[PDB]
């Protein structure tokens, strides 16, 4: 039974409405430095009394050198992440090389695309940011996928609720001529951009740094809180 069909204006409404669920999803951003890529995600507010030790954070490891973050339906994202992890191992097994970030993106994009044209399935209510480094290479990588299956690379990019806003920020603040040559000033730009939408919070913003050769570290509440302080100072210094 065909659920994803065309309408008279030439629009696939289910694909279209899937985008609306992404818009409703908590925000996520990624910016890519001269020798790094940083991923940042806001935290929800339906309830608070949660256990954060066990609850799945918003950035998933796919292989040791590639990470995936998303905005949209949480349950839909698990399914894409599983398939991505399975493919990552399968590529190693048959090509004796880990996936390029572009290849893993094309894979995930393909999966989403496939669900836009099969009977009895609804598209994925998910957009992904996929970030990391190709094996034996130092040039940083960042890619976006969407429920239609389109994908592309980004100097920087944001998705989810109020991404409209944060894309405005980055469009004037990210200089292609001068990518944030430090891990530090890369996290700085990533925090500034999230601040515009988050409405002040240390337990609101989470950050993950990815460097070459499988170097990926999550930050702590306090480590981020240090950037929170120095940004709210330099704005109040004016």
């Amino acid at each position: 039974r065909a659920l994803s069909i065309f309408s008279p204006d030439g629009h696939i409404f289910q694909v279209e409405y899937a985008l609306e669920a992404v818009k409703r999803g908590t925000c996520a951003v990624g910016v890519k430095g001269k020798n790094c890529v940083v991923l940042g995600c806001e935290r929800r507010s339906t309830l608070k009394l949660q256990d954060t030790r066990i609850t799945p954070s918003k950035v998933s490891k796919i292989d040791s050198h590639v990470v995936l973050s998303f905005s949209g339906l949480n349950a839909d994202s698990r399914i894409l992440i599983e398939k991505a992890r399975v493919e990552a191992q399968s590529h190693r097994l048959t090509l004796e090389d880990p996936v390029t970030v572009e290849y893993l993106t094309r894979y995930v994009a393909g999966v989403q695309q496939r669900y836009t044209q099969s009977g009895g399935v609804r598209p994925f209510g998910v957009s992904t940011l996929i970030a990391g480094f190709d094996p034996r290479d130092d040039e940083p990588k960042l890619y976006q996928t969407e429920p239609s299956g389109i994908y592309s690379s980004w100097s920087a990019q944001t998705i989810g609720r109020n991404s409209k806003t944060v894309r405005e920020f980055l469009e004037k603040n990210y200089d292609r001529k001068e990518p944030p040559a430090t891990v530090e000033e890369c996290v700085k730009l990533t925090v500034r951009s999230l601040l515009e939408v988050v409405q002040t919070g240390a337990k609101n913003i989470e950050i993950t740094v990815v460097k070459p050769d499988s170097d990926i570290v999550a930050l702590s509440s306090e480590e981020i809180n240090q950037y929170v302080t120095q940004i709210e100072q330099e704005k109040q210094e004016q």
Partner: protein, 235 residues
């Protein structure tokens, strides 16, 4: 299994709605254990509360669930959860980590969300479990296939009321006996009924016995609930 113009899943929303009328269940995570308490919706003098089970189910020796929603839909999912646990144990010779079992169940639910043209299960679960990686854990899953972990949480009828109270009285350095108390008080103030009696309750605890080194699952007998009611001054 279709999207609304707004980006919401009709049948899922409506299933959550179904659940919001089911008897309440509460999970509270202590330092040295976990409490499960649940209220039986629709009762009678003639209903056999002794040889009864409708909201609290054992999944494993280290994991129990509390059910809000359609009982029969729940048994389907409990049964496949019990099997997944056993497959894990057979495969690895280790009891299944709580998260893994929970992820599996959520995935099954998510399936009905995304394909097949069949109605979602009208069920929400609270998971109480222990494993050697994270110790005590409390989880929740609903028809959307979404799952999250909690210090305290409630499902079914009157969650806003019950949630507020738990937030008000819960503290990190709690002990199990206090959590038992907190569970009963919270149900006591959110009941759609006259007063909280023993025949309207199911109760379970997961405690790491001080004499041994292993974890014990207790599903309270009718008389045992009745007793634990007097102590806390609800007689």
């Amino acid at each position: 299994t279709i999207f609304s113009p707004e980006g919401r899943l009709y049948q899922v929303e409506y299933a959550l709605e179904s659940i919001s009328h089911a008897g309440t269940a509460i999970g509270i995570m202590a330092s040295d254990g976990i409490v499960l308490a649940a209220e039986r919706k629709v009762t009678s003098t003639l209903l056999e509360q002794d040889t009864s089970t409708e909201k609290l189910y054992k999944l494993n020796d280290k994991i129990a669930v509390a059910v809000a929603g359609l009982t029969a839909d729940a048994e389907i999912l409990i049964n496949t959860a019990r099997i997944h646990a056993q497959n894990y144990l057979k495969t690895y010779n280790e009891d299944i980590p709580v998260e893994i079992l929970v992820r599996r169940l959520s995935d099954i639910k998510q399936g009905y969300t995304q394909h097949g043209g069949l109605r979602p299960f009208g069920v929400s679960f609270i998971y109480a479990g222990y494993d050697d990686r994270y110790g005590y854990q409390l989880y929740t899953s609903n028809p959307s296939g979404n799952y999250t972990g909690w210090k305290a949480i409630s499902v079914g009828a009157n969650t806003s009321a019950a949630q507020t109270l738990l937030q008000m009285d819960y503290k990190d350095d709690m002990k199990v006996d206090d959590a038992i108390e907190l569970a009963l008080k919270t149900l006591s103030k959110t009941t759609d009924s006259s007063a909280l009696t023993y025949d309207r309750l199911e109760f379970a605890t997961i405690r790491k016995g001080a004499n041994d080194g292993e974890v014990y699952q207790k599903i309270f007998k009718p008389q045992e609930i009745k007793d634990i009611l007097v102590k806390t001054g609800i007689t």
